[PDB]
């Protein structure tokens, strides 16, 4: 290490790997005494270490307690200067930069006024949330860090209700009564609707009945211990801090649904209020118009020239710039192409003229363009392709129509995008240089042109009918709507208010390239009755880019969207942040305020924004959002940093294992793994942090005797931790997670999410079809975590316990469930198999084989490999991926080999049919979910053409009876004739 002393002296120190910066500084100022200039140096306390980190950003090391190898230095050199700048601010900035993965000082360098205004205006949301979380301190902070995990609807499903004994649930409460951790059981039977306060009261009743207290004394004791204790789930950091009915908590309701007995710890609330600290949020240091409707002119744009166009002049004939004005995915006018020019000189200097009039430009209009090439073979055999694309918003974030010359760097066409324009992509210039730069010029009208302030300028420019309006109302979002229905909906736009769920259809009936119609639509929306959140999320797709429609949708969400449903739909709600024209919008404020008042939401908010920081299109947007959140998440930045460090170390280990150890065999690879894991700084990083999959789960010491690399593709790393909770034995002692590097997990996450949604709706429907949507989280570029399901064995691993017979799975299940428990195991197996058949048929999941179909000792079946869905096999009839070979029917039929005669198989078919109809009834929700994932960049769905698959498996275009017949037809065809009856 070479140290640059302040007085121009330079000295080389023999530092060691683990030395802290305090030690290094003291050693350096000891060593400098050998050199001429030592006599003019001050005390070592007056200087700090400065250097350049691998991010390429100069860093001041105010936190001298850090270790040398932990600094993330670029080269072994050190610079010494007097400290300048605010200490705490700089350490917080480096913490944030490490958490979000890029330096915070970068955002201070972008000169874009939109970015500098966004990151200064979002602080209002952060301060409002921070004030919210301190309203009722210290209870409000405990609610922030330990938010109740409650269901949306207090009312229990009737089938779930009938599990209880006369409406009462048996609960065992644990009390730590002695310093030596003496554990006392209090088996307690209560009403399923008691709030935690009365459960506390009854537990205290049982705790003090032995002293035969008088009525007054007993009441005083009960009241005293009501305000002293709280209930915690045994084995995880889940707490009951709010007065919901006990059965509404997801833990207790899952206990009823599974038949288990809730285990609650009678923790003292002083311990809770002590274990959470007071971490605070502070303001960062950085904290002649004419109306558009008077222009009276056509829109025209000049294309000057292009550069850095990478196309073989020998192969392509000529190039041109294709353009078009788009509102969402709707062209406002016919597309305009420039004259073809040889690729040797991409220069046009051509004014492109558009049919759209300037006054009739909608606020959400954007210029979409791309450079294309012409392979002019024999006239009609000509073929076109896009070289690069880019989108320009006509109006900037401040409502100003773009004018004058501008330069746009064009993005690379996304893989698989055949279309010549990419209107679904993000707006903005490519930040990467050495990319095609297209020069444009917009007309100038002698002054800046503003979109009219519609607050004032909105003044400016039978029974069969009701039946038809209702019928159009019930149609699914992607259904084709003819021109006649579009005119009828606009004819009766005023009577459509009596049916509020017709807004998505009535908004597509507007002439968005007409000023008069859009003015009326705006006048209607501000008077619209609010609609359900499952429907307000439809108005956040790409199809509805108007700021008014999206504002109405966001208000509906903030009115009716519960935190349970917010966390259930967080993936989509973060995906649709890409469709927003501007950085500062209402959706981002809603999501940020919600994340800053509920750590359960904030955890996955961060890990979903963080998981796409590698994407350059959104990098800046999500980085600004993440900086704003991390500056205001309070204490959780420490745990986020711990998780980031752990995942980074695992990423490095797996990168090494597949880049240099790839050629070596299993034994030596495991040897390298175990050698690397046991080192002190891999031990410290990978132990004692919250689980990224579930922040309520602590990950303690590593069971290195159980960590191993699996035989699965690309050798995922199978970890295993202890559970440090003092009650871990009642939940689990083993916390195992599969770390996958090299597999794209953000489609598997979506598949599991949808399975969870549909299981929930089936359970609410009275269908007890069990689905196991295990945990999954994508944390970066094709790197993610997968929850390990305890006591699970792939059907291949069971057949391996032999030539294995057809009855092998049934024999195994019968042996694992000897006696009276056998019937329940078979019933649960049947229900899980039915649920998964329906789900995988509807979603077109990848093909199913013995190595990716799991089964527990409990009898429950479930699937693990969800790599492909919506039938990506088009590049080679919609197919059923999950087929019930005899190994499954034999189990379902309770050992009778008959394939389609037994009663049990008929009842299984009935479950399949009812579940399918239940999904088909809620098809709008799933279509809205898929249609909000189109900007995600997954190959499986990049356009609404891909979402047309689910519309086919659900058979939404047919009658419900005909949809039933279609489902039976498909099942019968795949299962060789067993489903015709």
């Amino acid at each position: 290490v070479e140290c640059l002393l302040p007085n121009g002296m330079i000295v080389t120190l023999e530092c060691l790997r683990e030395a802290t910066l305090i030690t290094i500084k003291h050693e350096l100022f000891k060593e400098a005494r050998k050199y001429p200039l030592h006599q003019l140096l001050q005390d070592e306390s007056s200087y700090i270490f400065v250097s350049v980190t691998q991010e390429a950003e100069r860093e001041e090391f105010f936190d001298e307690t850090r270790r040398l190898c932990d600094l993330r230095l670029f080269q072994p050199f050190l610079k010494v200067i007097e400290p300048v700048g605010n200490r705490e601010e700089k350490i917080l900035n480096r913490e944030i930069g490490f958490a979000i993965g890029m330096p915070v000082c970068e955002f201070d360098m972008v000169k874009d006024p939109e970015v500098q205004d966004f990151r200064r205006n979002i602080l209002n949301v952060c301060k409002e949330a921070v004030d919210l979380r301190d309203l009722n301190s210290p209870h409000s902070r405990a609610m922030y860090v330990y938010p109740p995990n409650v269901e949306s609807s207090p009312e229990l499903p009737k089938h779930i209700y009938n599990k209880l004994d006369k409406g009462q649930i048996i609960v065992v409460i644990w009390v730590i009564v002695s310093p030596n951790n003496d554990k006392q059981k209090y088996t307690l039977k209560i009403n399923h609707d008691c709030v935690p306060e009365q459960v506390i009261a009854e537990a205290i009743r049982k705790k003090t009945r032995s002293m035969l207290l008088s009525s007054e004394q007993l009441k005083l004791c009960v009241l005293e211990y009501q305000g002293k204790y709280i209930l915690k789930v045994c084995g995880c950091d889940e707490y009951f801090l709010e007065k919901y009915p006990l059965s509404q908590y997801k833990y207790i309701r899952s206990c009823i649904m599974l038949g288990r007995m809730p285990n609650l710890m009678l923790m003292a609330k002083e311990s809770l209020y002590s274990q959470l600290p007071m971490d605070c949020f502070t303001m960062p240091s950085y904290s002649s118009t004419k109306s558009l409707w008077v222009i009276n002119s056509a829109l025209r744009i000049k294309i000057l020239c292009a550069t850095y166009v990478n196309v073989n002049i020998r192969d392509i004939d000529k190039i041109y710039v294709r353009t078009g004005i788009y509102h969402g995915g709707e062209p406002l006018c016919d597309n305009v192409n420039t004259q073809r020019v040889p690729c040797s000189n991409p220069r046009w200097n051509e004014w492109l003229n558009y049919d759209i009039y300037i006054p009739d430009l909608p606020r959400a209009a954007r210029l979409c363009l791309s450079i294309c090439s012409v392979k002019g073979r024999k006239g009609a055999k000509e073929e076109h392709c896009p070289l690069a694309w880019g989108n320009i918003n006509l109006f900037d974030y401040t409502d100003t129509l773009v004018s004058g010359k501008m330069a746009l760097n064009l993005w690379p066409v996304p893989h698989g995008l055949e279309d010549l324009l990419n209107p679904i992509g993000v707006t903005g210039s490519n930040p990467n240089k050495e990319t095609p730069c297209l020069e444009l010029e917009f007309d100038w009208f002698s002054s800046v042109v503003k979109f009219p302030d519609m607050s004032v300028i909105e003044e400016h420019a039978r029974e069969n009918d009701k039946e038809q309006l209702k019928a159009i109302s019930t149609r699914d979002p992607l259904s084709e709507i003819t021109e006649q229905e579009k005119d009828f909906l606009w004819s009766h736009r005023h009577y459509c208010v009596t049916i509020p769920e017709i807004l998505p259809k009535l908004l597509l009936s507007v002439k968005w390239n007409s000023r008069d119609e859009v003015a009326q639509m705006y006048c209607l929306v501000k008077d619209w009755p609010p609609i359900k959140p499952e429907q307000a999320m439809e108005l956040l797709d790409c199809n509805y880019p108007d700021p008014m429609v999206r504002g109405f949708a966001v208000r509906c969400l903030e009115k009716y969207l519960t935190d349970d449903k917010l966390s259930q739909y967080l993936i989509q709600l973060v995906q649709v942040l890409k469709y927003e024209q501007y950085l500062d919008n209402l959706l981002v404020r809603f999501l940020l305020k919600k994340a800053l008042t509920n750590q359960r939401i904030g955890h996955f908010f961060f890990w979903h924004l963080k998981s796409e920081m590698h994407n350059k299109t959104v990098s800046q947007r999500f980085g600004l959002l993440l900086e704003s959140y991390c500056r205001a998440c309070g204490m959780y930045l420490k745990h986020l940093n711990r998780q980031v460090e752990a995942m980074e170390k695992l990423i490095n280990l797996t990168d090494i294992l597949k880049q240099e150890k790839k050629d070596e065999t299993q034994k030596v690879q495991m040897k390298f793994l175990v050698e690397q894991m046991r080192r002190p700084d891999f031990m410290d990083a990978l132990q004692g942090f919250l689980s990224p999959l579930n922040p309520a789960h602590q990950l303690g010491n590593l069971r290195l005797e159980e960590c191993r690399i699996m035989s699965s593709a690309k050798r995922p790393l199978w970890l295993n931790w202890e559970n440090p909770d003092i009650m871990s034995e009642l939940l689990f002692q083993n916390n195992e997670i599969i770390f996958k590097n090299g597999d794209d997990l953000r489609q598997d996450m979506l598949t599991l999410q949808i399975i969870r949604i549909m299981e929930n709706i089936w359970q609410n429907q009275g269908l007890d079809l069990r689905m196991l949507p295990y945990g999954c989280l994508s944390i970066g570029d094709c790197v993610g975590l997968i929850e390990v399901v305890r006591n699970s064995h792939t059907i291949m691993q069971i057949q391996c316990k032999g030539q294995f017979n057809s009855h092998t799975l049934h024999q195994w299940l019968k042996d694992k469930n000897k006696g009276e428990i056998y019937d329940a195991a078979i019933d649960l197996f049947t229900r899980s198999c039915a649920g998964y058949c329906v789900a995988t048929f509807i979603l077109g999941i990848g093909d199913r084989h013995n190595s990716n179909i799991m089964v527990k000792d409990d009898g429950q079946l479930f699937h693990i490999d969800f790599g492909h869905f919506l039938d990506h096999k088009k590049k080679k009839r919609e197919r059923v991926p999950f087929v019930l070979t005899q190994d499954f029917l034999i189990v379902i039929s309770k050992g009778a080999q008959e394939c389609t005669k037994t009663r049990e198989f008929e009842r299984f078919q009935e479950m399949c049919y009812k579940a399918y109809l239940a999904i088909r009834q809620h098809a709008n929700l799933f279509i809205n979910l898929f249609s909000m994932m189109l900007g995600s960049g997954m190959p499986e769905l990049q356009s609404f053409d891909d979402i047309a698959y689910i519309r086919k498996t659900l058979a939404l275009d047919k009658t419900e009876q005909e949809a039933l017949e279609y489902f039976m037809k498909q099942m019968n065809d795949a299962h060789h004739g067993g489903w015709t009856t």
Binding site: M9, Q75, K79, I316, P331, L332, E383, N432, D957
Partner: protein, 252 residues
């Protein structure tokens, strides 16, 4: 003259095949489908106007056809022929288009053996594109790593170079007093300081220059891969289209 034999009548093709057929086509081009609802009855006329595919229902009633309640036309073919010569504005002034360019289904103008070659040719042509794309993304991100390292080498030089200024500023006070004192030993020690600092700067700059040359070579290879992809892609699309056409022919 029967509808089944009309050039523009396609039958029960899906809305996605309609979008594919009508993509980027000229305004007025159209094709007539059997309704999305499979039940025997109304048809749908989908024509391109203003960059969009407008959908017009063809209501069937009492053996007659039309776009509206009067329903005077005798047959779908006669209706389209009427609007092949008359503007749609007579029906709806909302659009002034005319049915100009019917998307003919007769443009089809051993087959199993040939389809096998196209399936193989497309399959290997695709593998070329995915291989290039993964090699393209790898070089795209690796270029970013080498480009940020140049940003890091620029900073390192800024600090080393800044040191030279401090050494120049302070050495004068020592150098003059030593010269008048005759302390050549400390003077030569400061000269050795200069030598060490300059040598370290030279090493830094040499590594930076090697990095820059490697970066330029990597960027050239990156552009070569990009050009290869842009040349392959049109052939990939054309091969897929021809393979699908032959598959449809064989499925007849």
């Amino acid at each position: 003259m029967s509808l089944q034999d009309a050039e523009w009548y396609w039958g029960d093709i899906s809305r996605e095949e309609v979008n594919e057929k009508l993509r980027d086509t000229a305004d007025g081009t159209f094709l007539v489908r059997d309704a999305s609802t499979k039940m025997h009855g109304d048809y749908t006329l989908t024509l391109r106007k203003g960059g969009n595919n407008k959908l017009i229902k063809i209501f069937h009633r009492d053996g007659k056809y039309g776009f509206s309640d009067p329903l005077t036309f005798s047959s779908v073919v006669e209706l389209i022929n009427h609007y092949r010569n008359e503007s749609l504005a007579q029906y709806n002034p909302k659009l002034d288009v005319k049915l100009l360019y019917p998307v003919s289904k007769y443009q089809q103008d051993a087959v199993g053996k040939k389809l096998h070659e196209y399936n193989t040719q497309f399959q290997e042509k695709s593998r070329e594109y995915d291989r290039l794309y993964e090699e393209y993304t790898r070089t795209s991100q690796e270029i970013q790593m080498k480009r940020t390292a140049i940003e890091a080498f620029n900073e390192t030089i800024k600090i080393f170079e800044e040191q030279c200024q401090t050494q120049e500023r302070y050495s004068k006070e020592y150098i003059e007093k030593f010269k008048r004192e005759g302390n050549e030993k400390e003077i030569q020690r400061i000269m050795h300081n200069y030598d060490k600092l300059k040598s370290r700067i030279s090493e830094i700059i040499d590594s930076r220059r090697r990095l820059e040359e490697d970066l330029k070579k990597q960027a050239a290879e990156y552009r070569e891969i990009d050009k290869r992809m842009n040349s392959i892609k049109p052939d990939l699309i054309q091969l897929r289209k021809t393979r699908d056409q032959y598959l449809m022919w064989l499925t007849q």
